[PDB]
Design a protein around this ligand. Structure first.
Ligand SMILES: O=C(O)[C@H]1CNC[C@@H](O)[C@@H]1O
Ligand SMILES: O=C(O)[C@H]1CNC[C@@H](O)[C@@H]1O
Lengths: 602, 599
């Protein structure tokens, strides 16, 4: 049960104050000598939210593998006497264990979705309470994402993994204590059905803990348009203002939880909108839609994957300027602020789990050992990797279920689907995801070397999501040969599956400032030509309903002879400065009419 | 047999000067309709010397594979009535064939050595004469370097190859027309022996066609120090000025060709010095020398591999500043002007053939064959092309005091058997053709001491290691333990001198990092210094040459950010902050003397 904390006859004390106490544990005795009992020794100040790696400008904290210790004191408000108090961490990256004055209250593995615990019986209103958090940043074959922790002869651990972004860790989003009455709405689910844009039914179901419920649906003018009663089985009839790409009109669903003595009211934002895959078209409110935009990353210069409000306002200014209407939460669930923003401004979003790197055939990642000889086996990606993967799909859906901006679930990104057993693994989670949320189409993002003749699992999903790099990793430099290989591949995919096709990753590494008269790899002129050749192919294949440039911005990776200080396929630099290709995309995406496929002309 | 032209009663008109007419031949019909009979149709101005690839800022010229046509007119000087006249191309890269007004005079395969021809019966002094050159840049398995032309499904050629530098082609060095009397010295060989630097001997052997000759030795003051005579070679011995890596003193041996009617005088520069490998030591006139310097490339911005005097003077100023006393002519024979400069200033040179890319296990260059040494690919025909490359490299550079060692090939894969069947005869024929200098073969990283098969056949051990870059990436401390364990494993196996001819890490100028991580200028500094503190504790190491004096152009790949970035300087010769590191080390050292495990 997961709900976004809101402030309506409910209160929150943001504990994000940053400047927590921070300590590493190289001897791995913090669990032994009970570090949560007293003030951290030889600690230093750390900002929260924020990864711990880049904050101190020291490589040995940056590449540390093990447990980190955060600690903070906080005075708990007097006026929260008869109230229930909840300690919430919206993301502790990988593993987190918390102590409230020598008492463990919570424990979570999963670095990108929130976890909380009821803290009332160990908190006194008016007294200062000390909060110790043990965070772990290791990945094994049953974590999501997977990885291999490699011990040397002296016990120093080096993390190897198989995905192309740096494994930033720490407390990445907002830590809060919030209240609630002892009768409280604990979960809301809303489904919206659309019938040619004139009258529609909003199935409601609510799991209040301790009260009867009435619901009331208010519009943007806060006028009541519909009322309902009952723990569930609320379905309200409207003459509506649809949630549309571009505007994002949001109704408001006020859920009342009234007991004999107390009362609780929760406002949930509701977008009225239907998503459906019919033929080779991805229909939003029964109209064919064309995706434009980006694969993104939660990546910045000194906060790592730390959330930040200026960074979110500025990147949406840029995505609005360049003409993008969509993005994919590339490789992990994002902060909820991001999806709340998409809800307000009508931005279409593909939501993605953290299941990246189910593939040991890429030079991508960190290679500090020897990879297993078979990916789908008891040693690697086993039945428990599958249960961890299921668990990650349920937590992801459990948080973003009612966001109207989410149009698709991405179960995984570029798994290797050649070995038999890839389907033994992915088929159960594809049907289990459809049983978790049957209102949104389902996808898995397909790697380049699993061509249409070789891929084994793509028929289990609704939309085909492709990542292609013809002319970069293969046919390097040869635009005219690449155009032929790409058009042949895309027509083969369409003929075999007859699904809609979104290209979720296409891009080339580009040094900002490197220019060439020969349109060479790594030059800004190559990026431009390469993107425009891809665009001429898309416009000639009817089944293509989306284009998402691989990254919006340069981002940090682990060290390797393929990664010049990070991955450089961004349209913008890491400090958000535009490369030449940014004006290429702006002319395309603002020259098309909104949400519709270019008819191969202009 | 070949000599570099000079000028005391021998003449020269360098047709190098300026613009020739240039045209591609995408239809391969130049030979068919015999383009040498008329002026090139639809030509354009090209500069010689210079690669044709980068001169036009056209991608379709730059990546061209096939035939290209140079053409030029020239007035034959009138004072040349009774002289015999030679047309000399000092380099036409890969293949050239020459016409001198509808008469074909010469043709050469091998893109880095000179080739000439007598042109007298086809010129008469005082008239304009047309020169057409058909240049080819295709590599196959029987060329040095080898390559693989793959033709598409219908029509176009694309050239694949296995070395890590761009395949620049065209007329890269000087084109000259020179005269000579009809009795003339054709070739001169000089070998010099020293014992304890007090009074020593110049064994002479020379071929003068067309007459009996005086041979006379003058010193830097034009003072005659010994005269001796014959027609073929006999020895000379007086009290000398040794050619030393510090100074570079050059005596001069004049050869005066006496015939009945005519006479011809050739001035040859002679540096009197010995070279010998003894135990683990590289001795120059019997004192151990310690090499410092660079693997270099002939690579400038708009000219490709075209020679250029300003670029030569500037790069030598920079190597002089940084303190390097040596360098290796990485992966092809260099311009002779470099080796004459090395003569004058006493720079020690490791000279090398174009035998690069005898390895299909790298991810550099460019359906490749299964086994390196077989009939498909490297066969008996490649072995003779390889030997021929050695023949004309040695025949070109035998008289240079600065050429201290020959390198027969660069990073060949010596794991498949047949590598020794291939390389044993090459080593012995090379010793047969010049036994005055040691010979080596530079060894790849993945063929460490317990894998390599042909280290025995050479006098010094040449190593190219990149621990911390291509393996244990970023890990300076584990790279240190691999690097030093190997350096001692090699010395126990062979007790050879060990010159590290390649070590470097790609580094983008401007990229700085508080973490000492790859691609940053800081990583380049720390990595180099760690390799240095490993060198100084291994007794058998005789030289260090960091991989590359300057960023250079390669073929396009995901491993090459707009070229190879392992340079100490950038392509325009600006110093990355590691240049100050090496100048600290190479100038704090005593000259040519190893650091004694410290400072
Ligand atoms: O290699 C790349 O640039 C991309 C290839 N596909 C997966 C991404 O995580 C990765 O960033
Ligand atoms: O990979 C590299 O940078 C070097 C490795 N050894 C041989 C060089 O030609 C090459 O350039």
């Amino acid at each position: 049960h997961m709900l976004r904390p809101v402030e309506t006859p409910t209160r929150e004390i943001k504990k994000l104050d940053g400047l927590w106490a921070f300590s590493l544990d190289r001897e791995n005795c913090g669990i032994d000598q009970r570090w949560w009992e007293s003030a951290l020794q030889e600690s230093r100040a750390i900002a929260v939210p924020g990864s711990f790696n880049d904050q101190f400008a020291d490589a040995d904290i940056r590449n540390y593998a093990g447990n980190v210790w955060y600690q903070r004191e906080v005075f708990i408000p007097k006026g929260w006497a008869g109230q229930r108090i909840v300690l919430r961490f919206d993301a502790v990256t990988h593993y987190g264990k918390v102590w409230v004055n020598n008492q463990e209250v919570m424990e979570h593995q999963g670095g990108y979705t929130p976890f909380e615990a009821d803290v009332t019986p160990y908190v006194i209103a008016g007294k200062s309470v000390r909060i110790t958090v043990c965070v772990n940043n290791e990945l094994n074959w049953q974590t999501i994402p997977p990885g291999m922790v490699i011990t040397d002869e002296n016990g120093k651990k080096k993390q190897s993994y198989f995905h192309d972004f740096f494994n930033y860790a720490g407390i990445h989003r907002s830590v809060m204590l919030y209240t609630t009455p002892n009768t409280w709405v604990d979960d809301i689910t809303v489904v919206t059905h659309v019938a040619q844009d004139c009258n529609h039914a909003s199935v409601d179901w609510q799991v209040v803990a301790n009260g009867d419920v009435s619901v009331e649906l208010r519009d943007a003018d806060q006028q009541v348009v519909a009322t309902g009663q009952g723990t569930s089985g609320t379905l309200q009839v409207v003459n509506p203002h649809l949630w549309q790409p571009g505007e994002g009109y949001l109704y408001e669903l006020c859920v009342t939880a009234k007991s004999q003595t107390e009362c609780d009211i929760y406002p949930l934002r509701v977008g009225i909108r239907s998503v459906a895959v019919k033929g080779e078209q991805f229909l939003i409110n029964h109209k064919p839609f064309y995706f434009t935009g980006f694969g993104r990353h939660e990546d910045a210069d000194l906060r790592g994957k730390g959330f930040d409000n200026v960074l979110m306002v500025h990147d949406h200014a840029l995505m609005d300027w360049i003409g993008a209407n969509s993005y994919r939460t590339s490789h992990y669930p994002y902060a909820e602020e991001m999806l709340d923003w998409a809800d307000e401004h009508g931005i279409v979003v593909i939501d993605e789990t953290a299941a990246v790197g189910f593939n040991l055939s890429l030079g991508i990642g960190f290679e500090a050992g020897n990879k297993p000889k078979e990916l789908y086996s008891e040693e690697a990606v086993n039945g428990e990797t599958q249960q961890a993967h299921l668990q990650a799909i349920k937590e992801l859906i459990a948080r973003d279920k009612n966001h109207p901006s989410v149009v698709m679930w991405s179960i995984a990104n570029e798994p290797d689907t050649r070995p038999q057993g890839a389907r033994e693994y992915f088929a159960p989670l594809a049907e289990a995801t459809r049983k978790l949320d049957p209102t949104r189409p389902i996808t898995c993002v397909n790697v380049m070397f699993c061509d249409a003749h070789t891929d084994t699992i793509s028929d289990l999903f609704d939309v085909l999501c492709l990542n292609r790099y013809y002319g970069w990793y293969v046919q390097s430099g040869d635009l005219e040969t690449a155009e032929k290989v790409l058009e042949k591949e895309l027509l083969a995919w369409q003929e075999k599956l007859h699904q809609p096709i979104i290209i979720t990753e296409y891009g080339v590494d580009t040094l900002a400032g490197l220019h060439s008269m020969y349109t060479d790899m790594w030059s800004e002129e190559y990026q431009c030509a390469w993107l425009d050749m891809y665009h001429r192919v898309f416009d000639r294949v009817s089944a293509v309903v989306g284009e998402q440039v691989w990254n919006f911005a340069d981002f940090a990776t682990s060290q390797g002879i393929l990664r010049v200080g990070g991955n450089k396929k961004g349209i913008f630099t890491r400090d958000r400065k535009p490369k030449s290709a940014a004006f290429l995309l702006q002319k395309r995406w603002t020259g098309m009419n909104f949400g519709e496929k270019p008819q191969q002309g202009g």
